[PDB]
């Protein structure tokens, strides 16, 4: 028996838009209602690949557009095992950033070619739902530690914001106004996650 028992939820969004904050809250909420959950995020900067992705973002190095893109996708693929497993077991996975981030950022910030960009992530496990913490490009420039990494320039974030729309109208995509109080965002999130039916199912894969 291999059906998919856990639930896989992804947060997406501009930089400094509260992805962590909201993923932590969703996690603790679920912990509270007795649902085993594992928090992951992407990129995972601890693996070999991650380490390279990391220097790239911190501008400790440079690499061509297509290399870093590929590196990002690879990084997700090295977690498909863990994820299938948790999900097989009934552990929900709350993830922050996934392939959506890949296409969005590469195609927006590095003028890559949307189909080209999706291609390598194609076949990755599809999540049950994506929460897009929607915020205006200039909004987050105020937050905590903005500007400390390669893509954290208003002009660039404006470019990215437009590419996120490439999923904006997709059934699993759930826009969320993220310019509000933390607990307002949190509650919308919960209301939507309760709508969910649990029930073992079959896995689905990007980009269906």
Ligand X SMILES: Cc1cn([C@H]2C[C@H](N=[N+]=[N-])[C@@H](COP(=O)(O)O)O2)c(=O)[nH]c1=O
Site string (90-129) toward a copy of itself, x via CB under 8 A: --------------------------x--xx-xx------
Residue among 32, 34, 81, 144 that touches a copy of itself (CB under 8 A): 81
Please report which helix (H) or strand (E) contains residue 91, including its range. none
The reply, when asked if residue 15 is annotated as ligand binding, is: yes
> From the list 28, 36, 78, 162, which residue makes contact with a copy of itself (rule: CB under 8 A)?
78
CB atoms within 10 A of CB 32: 8
Q: Provide the minimum distance between the beta carbon of 15 and ligand ADP in the complex, in angstroms, as a whole number.
A: 6
Nearer to a copy of itself by Cβ, of 49 and 193: the residue is 49
- Site for ligand X, residues 23 to 52, rule: CB under 6 A: 42-43
d(CA 10, CA 107) in angstroms, rounded, equals 20
φ, ψ of residue 130 to 5 degrees: the values are -115, 125
Which one, 13 or 127, has the nearer CB to ligand ADP? 13
- Tokens describing residue 191: 């209301």
Side by side, which strands form the sheet with 92-96? 37-41, 92-96, 8-13, 129-134, 173-177
Q: Give 35-38 contacts, CB < 8 A, sequence gap 24+.
A: 35/92, 36/6, 36/89, 36/90, 36/91, 36/92, 37/91, 37/92, 37/93, 37/94, 38/86, 38/91, 38/92, 38/93, 38/94
Residues 56-75 that bind a copy of itself (CB under 8 A): 63-64, 66-67, 70-71, 73-74
Distance CA 107, CA 166 (A): 10
Q: Does 16 bind ligand ADP (CB under 6 A)?
A: yes
Q: Which helix (H) or strand (E) holds 136?
A: none
| Contact between 21 and ligand ADP per CB under 6 A | yes
Name which of residues 67 to 106 contact ligand X (CB under 6 A): 72, 97, 101-102, 105-106
- Of 9, 10, 8, 12, the C-alpha closest to 132 is 12
Residue ranges binding ligand X (CB under 6 A): 15, 42-43, 57, 72, 97, 101-102, 105-106, 149-152
Residues that constitute the known binding site for dGMP: 15, 72, 76, 97, 105-106, 151
Residues that constitute the known binding site: 15-21, 45, 72, 76, 97, 105-106, 151, 180
Residue ranges binding ligand ADP (CB under 6 A): 13, 15-21, 143-144, 182, 185
């Amino acid at each position: 028996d291999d059906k998919k028992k856990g639930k896989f939820i992804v947060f997406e969004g501009l930089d400094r838009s509260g992805k962590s904050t909201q993923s932590k809250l969703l996690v603790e909420y679920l912990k509270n209602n007795n649902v085993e959950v594992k928090h992951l995020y992407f990129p995972n900067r601890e693996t070999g690949i991650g380490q390279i992705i990391s220097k790239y973002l911190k501008m400790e190095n440079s690499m061509s557009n297509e290399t870093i893109h590929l590196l990002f996708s690879a990084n997700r693929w090295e977690h498909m095992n863990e994820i299938k497993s948790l999900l097989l077991k009934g552990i929900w996975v709350v993830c922050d950033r996934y392939a959506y981030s890949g296409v969005a950022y590469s195609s927006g910030a590095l003028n890559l070619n949307k189909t080209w960009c999706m291609n390598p992530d194609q076949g990755l496990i599809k999540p049950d739902v994506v929460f897009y913490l929607n915020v205006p490009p200039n909004y987050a420039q105020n937050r905590s530690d903005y500007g400390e990494e390669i893509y954290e320039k208003v002009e660039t974030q404006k470019k990215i914001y437009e590419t996120y729309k490439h999923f904006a109208h997709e059934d699993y995509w759930i826009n969320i106004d993220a310019t509000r109080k933390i607990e307002d965002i949190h509650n919308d999130i919960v209301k939507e996650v309760t709508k969910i039916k649990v029930e073992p199912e079959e896995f689905n894969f990007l980009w269906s």
